[PDB]
Amino acid sequence: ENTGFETTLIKGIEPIRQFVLAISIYHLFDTKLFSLLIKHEVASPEVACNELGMEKEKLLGLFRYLKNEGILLETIDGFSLSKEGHALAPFEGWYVMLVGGYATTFLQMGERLQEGAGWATRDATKVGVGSCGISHFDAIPLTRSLMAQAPGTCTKLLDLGCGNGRYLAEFCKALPQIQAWGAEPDRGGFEEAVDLIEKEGLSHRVHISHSGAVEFLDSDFDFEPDFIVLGFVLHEILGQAGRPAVVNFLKKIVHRFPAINLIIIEVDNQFDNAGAMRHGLALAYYNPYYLLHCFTNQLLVQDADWLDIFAEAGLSLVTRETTSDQVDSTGLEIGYLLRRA
Amino acid sequence: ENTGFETTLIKGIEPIRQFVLAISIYHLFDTKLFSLLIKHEVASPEVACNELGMEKEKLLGLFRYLKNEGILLETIDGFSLSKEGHALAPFEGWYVMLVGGYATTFLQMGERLQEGAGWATRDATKVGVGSCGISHFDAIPLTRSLMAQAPGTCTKLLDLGCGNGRYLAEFCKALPQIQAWGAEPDRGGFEEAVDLIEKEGLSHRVHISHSGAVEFLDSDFDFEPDFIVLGFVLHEILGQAGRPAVVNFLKKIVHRFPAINLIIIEVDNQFDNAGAMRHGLALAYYNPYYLLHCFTNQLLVQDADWLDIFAEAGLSLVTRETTSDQVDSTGLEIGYLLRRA
Amino acid sequence: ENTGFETTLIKGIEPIRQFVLAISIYHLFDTKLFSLLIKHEVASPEVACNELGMEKEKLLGLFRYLKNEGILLETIDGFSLSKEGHALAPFEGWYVMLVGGYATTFLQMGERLQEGAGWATRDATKVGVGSCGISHFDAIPLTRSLMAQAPGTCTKLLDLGCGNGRYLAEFCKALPQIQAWGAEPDRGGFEEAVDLIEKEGLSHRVHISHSGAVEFLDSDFDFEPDFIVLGFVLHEILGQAGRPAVVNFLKKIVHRFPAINLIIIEVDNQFDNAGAMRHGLALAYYNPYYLLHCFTNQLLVQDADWLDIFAEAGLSLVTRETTSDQVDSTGLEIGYLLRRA
Amino acid sequence: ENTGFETTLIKGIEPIRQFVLAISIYHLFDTKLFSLLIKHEVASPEVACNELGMEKEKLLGLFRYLKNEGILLETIDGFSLSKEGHALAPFEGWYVMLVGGYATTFLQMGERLQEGAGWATRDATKVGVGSCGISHFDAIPLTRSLMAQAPGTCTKLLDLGCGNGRYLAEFCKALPQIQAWGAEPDRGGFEEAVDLIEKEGLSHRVHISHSGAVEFLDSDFDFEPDFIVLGFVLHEILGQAGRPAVVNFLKKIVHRFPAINLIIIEVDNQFDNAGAMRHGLALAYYNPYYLLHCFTNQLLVQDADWLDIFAEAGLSLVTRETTSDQVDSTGLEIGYLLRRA
Ligand SMILES: C[S@@+](CC[C@H](N)C(=O)[O-])C[C@H]1O[C@@H](n2cnc3c(N)ncnc32)[C@H](O)[C@@H]1O
Ligand SMILES: C[S@@+](CC[C@H](N)C(=O)[O-])C[C@H]1O[C@@H](n2cnc3c(N)ncnc32)[C@H](O)[C@@H]1O
Ligand SMILES: C[S@@+](CC[C@H](N)C(=O)[O-])C[C@H]1O[C@@H](n2cnc3c(N)ncnc32)[C@H](O)[C@@H]1O
Ligand SMILES: C[S@@+](CC[C@H](N)C(=O)[O-])C[C@H]1O[C@@H](n2cnc3c(N)ncnc32)[C@H](O)[C@@H]1O
Ligand SMILES: [Mg+2]
Ligand SMILES: [Mg+2]
Ligand SMILES: [Mg+2]
Ligand SMILES: [Mg+2]
Ligand code: NA
Ligand code: NA
Ligand code: NA
Ligand code: NA
Ligand code: NA
Ligand code: NA
Ligand code: NA
Ligand code: NA
To answer: Where are the membrane-spanning stretches (chains A, B, C, D)?
Structure first.
């Protein structure tokens, strides 16, 4: 009979309905259709196709799908972002990072669970670009707050694992005296960083290198940074190379630059903390973030584990802060301002 | 200031939270962890790992993620499906089809929108296995209803595009006189069909061929089916080969078997019908289904377009029915019972 | 142990969380706080209190509650409507009708289920005001569409069960030549109608009477309307007085005004129609609407039952239409344009 | 044109859809229909009507409404609780308290905001019965944990503001040696307490008095309790009588019983704490709870304010605990075990 089955089916596949919506919103941003709709206000599929070099029948299908979900409006003149569509604008970075960067990673979990199957891969170009977009809201203001509390003023800034260079673009625009250097090991992210710096008119003040963090510190250069930012990069080194390697890397930084101010941003691993995981942002963001870190070659640890690593590396904590409670009130994103002990 | 940003962020990325949940539920089913939890009732990560050949730290991460979402319970003895987890059991086919089969397809939409980029690919093995799982609820009962209304009793059944052979397994178990033949062009789906038929003890009554529908009808065989089922296959032929090819294929069927009863199941294309698209199942299932058909080499048309194709092919409609309103009340899934005019 | 109980509790009481939010949004509109926030942009509790004659500690509690739900933003200068709060503006009529008018009705259902307990009461003033607010979107445009299909021109309009007189105000602003008369039996609704007509500068063109529909038609007056509108009033007469009374009332209308055009708006009773009840607006609005109509002295019947009543009353159907699919695509709200047979 | 209005309307009035569902679930429990469906498994409206003395057409309306929402299933034999309906069972206390006890309170907020309008009323019988139902999960296990940490053994227990006496029934069933006395000032709650104690076969061990807490301590009796429980009652006395009255009341307790162990359960007022208010249970339960406490004659204060009151009353804190993180992980429900300083 299957009595009452349909009502249970509609609820049972609600995650699938939102799964397709999340990928469709990601493409709406990533293909620049979102930016096109903002600029044109109303655009026919023909006009959007001519501008972005797309095929009309496929574009009309995406637009009809989004209109059925209320993201777009359709009039005789074409399609436009609805109020709900416009409201998505600030969240671009989260879609780019988690869908663009990590969709393949989540899809690989079944095969990667097998004994000896290795780490799930990701699209590190989208992870870096998306992460930088998110950092505009949480990590960049946290880094700015920590920088203002250091005894010295920043004049030469080094950002290792810089993604598309958004921290350097924001700090340099706000603080005109700064000269900066970013290192990004992902080739795609490195190319986006060189492009962003050029587009912002900062190429005379900011250089980007295609390099990993450890290899950059082992390389030869005359730049003498007074600040180094490690935004969510130490846990990647921790997973990739191990704890002794992280301690040695931090020791190398203060051996080479004894007067440097280090700003480290990390996520506290509270995956197994029942109360922390009930916060709406811990469930929407941190729960999938913790899951992907169990399948990739990256290792999140607790606030106390980081403090112990800093002590072992011969670093003193100047101050520790979490993000503004207006953007992320979980207390899981922590910034540390450190100096040589 | 970003005043009130976090509350908007939690709602803004709700599709991403459910996107990861949908992929995680898909793996819970696909890896056989769901079946293991049903059998064991409670299982430690060590016990599940030993049984399925998995790695404990990755499995513990998936289990902790699912426990945070309420799908699993954790006690000192291990993990178990919660009431919410158990409730997911009937929906396996939808997760396997839409996530397993079509996740890559949705992820390809951005690149496939470009002029000349071609059709998005899919994992046709998962599409066929998942589709057969869904058909247990909607299309198999619809096919059974249409078969009972035909003038002749079924003795030799041909199922073209059979997936894992679930229609043949269900009809043969319920109707012991039937001999059946299935054709599935996807190698993976064909192998699952041979395995399912063997596991059900039906290899003496059901044969499966690795073949497409048109090529199967052009092949040489002595089998004289009195019923042919085309469950969601004509729209694939329509997209792949065009309307004249579909008409010629239908004409070939009644030329070769003039007394045959044809049962065709298709989805009515009402993507642009405002009222139809507000039904909860049209939004959860048919909206993403219509979207994927704009990006793959398959073409959905309306009920009237199908009736016109049948008239052109020299077929008469015996009866037309939609699915039981207890499982799918949209009126979009339509079954046609046809014979030679 | 209550293992995993909290996650089930948060979902289990989700209807209670939204129950309080719905009442709070209703008060935000009804107390004029919503209009105050629109005008001031930002207001401290002190400023809102002084303007509306409210108590600061209670107002701060409502504001903090709404801020936690994201309806309001709080800055050093005070509270403001968020983008989410602004987006609620068009829905005022639904909150005023279903919460203001019918909260007491839903709350009485437990006691009214008892044998001989009678009909649940409602706040008919809020039902009329709220219903008129809703009608701006659905029923007024439907009435306008039906009026344009009638032969001749409207010069004298009679609206029986007019609520706050919104149809008369809207029709008088679009058709500056018409004179109008409204009858509303609820004293509160009648007083709101006299006030709305005066505020719109229409008192020289529109008269309102405190009267029921049947009693108005039995009264003495020289007004010769060429159009009579019965917007969701016949089913109230049907419940209150019975089917013979409705037929007699309709007969009386065309006996007194043989050349009149009648426009009747009614809701088709499809409470027991599985497919109809899966539409998102059927669940959000029509399911509670049907429930209220089982506990109040009002009777909804099917489209065919209305057509039979019109035939028995000696009326002929000129045309029948449903609402625009841009506002209500259920097909449940039906407008009939009738004349004497 | 109202382009795309319907999709915005369905989301805009989602709180109203859940508002009606919450009231309907409350009645399903309160009228004993939920218990009837559990016992019968399947019941026709006629059978439920005959058993509970209800009217068939109204009951059929409630049942059809619930079936459309998936709470009930309908077969030829009648209606039954679906899996979703069965899953509601543990949450009865929350529906009885917040809907039964406080629906009138939320509905009065608009009028009670006016200067000099006084405190909103509530149905204290439903608040006490509902609160006791909730306490089975959170506060009773917390009280049991605190009792086990006190020196000696409980033999005489006094519960002031006992509601329906559920703590006394549960403590008497787990500790068969204890005698108990409860005081409840609400007449309805007092009568439910006398009935519950009798139904549990505990009338020879447990006495209930119709009295407030302060008046009970001022009355004459020979009972010498070694434990007194004040479960969510001190904040009611605080609002009703003021801080000096609460301090005097606590002083009176240890003056009369110098060796007594006091167990006080209170909710920490973190209404204005951004991070606390993002927890799913803080939004679902504590946000409406805080709102009700701004409109009723009850005052919630912070953990530090309670500790200060205890110090001023001459009490010393033995231990302080929050609820099990399996049921309530907000840290907002706090239990204090106190003794004379
Ligand atoms: C999570 S993203 C953070 C980007 C940026 N720092 C921010 O805070 O938004 C981590 C970045 O570090 C890069 N990365 C990974 N391993 C690294 C390594 N060993 N050295 C330097 N960067 C690394 C990744 O490619 C990626 O761009
Ligand atoms: C949507 S699934 C439906 C499976 C099954 N008939 C059912 O109703 O559940 C479509 C199936 O047809 C197969 N198919 C695709 N093109 C085909 C063709 N030209 N001939 C035969 N089968 C085809 C696919 O590989 C897939 O297994
Ligand atoms: C659902 S409201 C509809 C108001 C308005 N016609 C509209 O379409 O928005 C029904 C109105 O009819 C009024 N009413 C109820 N019984 C009536 C009667 N016997 N005669 C006239 N009006 C009646 C109610 O007081 C209420 O104002
Ligand atoms: C929130 S209920 C808590 C009931 C029970 N103690 C529990 O923990 O579930 C508060 C109860 O205290 C009662 N109450 C209110 N004012 C009181 C007073 N001054 N003295 C005693 N009880 C009071 C109310 O009637 C109600 O039954
Ligand atoms: Mg990382
Ligand atoms: Mg297909
Ligand atoms: Mg009505
Ligand atoms: Mg209280
Ligand atoms: Na981040
Ligand atoms: Na890892
Ligand atoms: Na299907
Ligand atoms: Na296609
Ligand atoms: Na209406
Ligand atoms: Na009625
Ligand atoms: Na409580
Ligand atoms: Na209060």
So the answer is: none
Say which of C6, C274, C278 has its CB closest to residue A278: C6
What are the respective helix, strand and coil percentages of chain B, to the nearest 5? 55, 15, 30
SS3 D230: strand
What contacts D17, CB < 8 A, 6 or more positions away?
C18, C283, C284, C285, C287, C288
Which amino acid does the sequence have at A25?
I
- Joined tokens for residue A225: 């940074």
Cα of B159 from ligand 13 centre, angstroms: 50
| Residues within 6 Å of ligand 4 by CB | D 124, 127-128, 131-132, 135, 139, 160-163, 184-186, 189, 212-213, 231-233, 236-237, 240
For residue C62, report the distance from its CA to the centre of ligand 4, in Å: 24
Enumerate the domain spans of chain C.
5-89, 94-340
Rounded to whole angstroms, the Cα distance separating B193 from B202 reads 11
Nearest to D249 by CA among D332, D310, D190, D186: D310
User: Quick one: how far is CA A298 from the chain centroid?
Assistant: 14
Residue B263 CA to residue B311 CA, distance in Å, equals: 15
Q: How many CB atoms lie within 10 A of CB B226?
A: 17
Cα–Cα distance measured from residue D216 to residue C68, given in angstroms and rounded to the nearest whole number = 39
Contact flag D290-C2 (C-beta cutoff 8 Å): no
Residue D312 exposed, middle or buried by CB count within 10 Å (0-12, 13-18, 19+) = middle
Query: Looking at the CA of D184, which ligand is closest?
Result: 4
Axis crossing angle, helix D56-68 with helix D45-52, rounded to the nearest 10: 120
H-helix or E-strand containing C7? helix C5-12
What CATH code is assigned to D94-340? 3.40.50.150
| CATH (one of 3.60.40.10, 1.10.10.10, 3.40.50.740, 3.40.50.300) for B5-89 | 1.10.10.10
- Taking contacts as CB-CB distances below 8 angstroms, the residues of chain A near D77 are none
Pairing of strands A261-267, A333-340: antiparallel
Which CATH class, in words, describes the domain spanning A5-88? mainly alpha
Measure B326 CA to nearest chain D CA, in Å. 11
Name the amino acid, one letter, at C271: F
Fold of domain B107-340: Rossmann fold (3.40.50)
Strand (E) positions, B45-147? 72-75, 78-81
Angle (CA) A179-A185-A189 rounded to 5° is 80
Neighbours of C222 (CB within 10 A): 4
The experimental technique behind this entry is X-ray
CB C86, CB C13: distance < 8 Å: no
Nearest residue on chain B to A68, alpha-carbon basis: B277
Round to whole Å and give the CA distance between A61 and B291: 6
Question: What are the residue ranges of helices labelled H in chain D?
Answer: 5-12, 14-30, 33-40, 45-52, 56-68, 83-87, 92-95, 103-112, 124-135, 139-148, 166-174, 187-199, 213-218, 234-241, 243-256, 280-281, 287-295, 303-312
Distance, in Å, from the CA atom of C333 to the CA atom of C313, rounded to the nearest integer, reads 22
3-state secondary structure labels for all residues of chain A:
CCCCHHHHHHHHCHHHHHHHHHHHHHHHHHCCHHHHHHHHCCECHHHHHHHHCECHHHHHHHHHHHHHCCCEEEECCEEEECHHHHHCHHHHHHHHHHHHHCHHHHHHHHHHCECCCCCCCCCHHHHHHHHHHHHCCCHHHHHHHHHHHCCCCCCEEEEECCCCCHHHHHHHHHCCCCEEEEECCCHHHHHHHHHHHHHCCCCCCEEEECCCHHHHHHCCCCCCCCEEEEECCHHHHHHHHCHHHHHHHHHHHHHHCCCCEEEEEEECCCCCCCCHHHEHHHHHHHHHHHHHHHHCCCCCCCHHHHHHHHHHCCEEEEEEEECCCCCCCCCCEEEEEEEEC
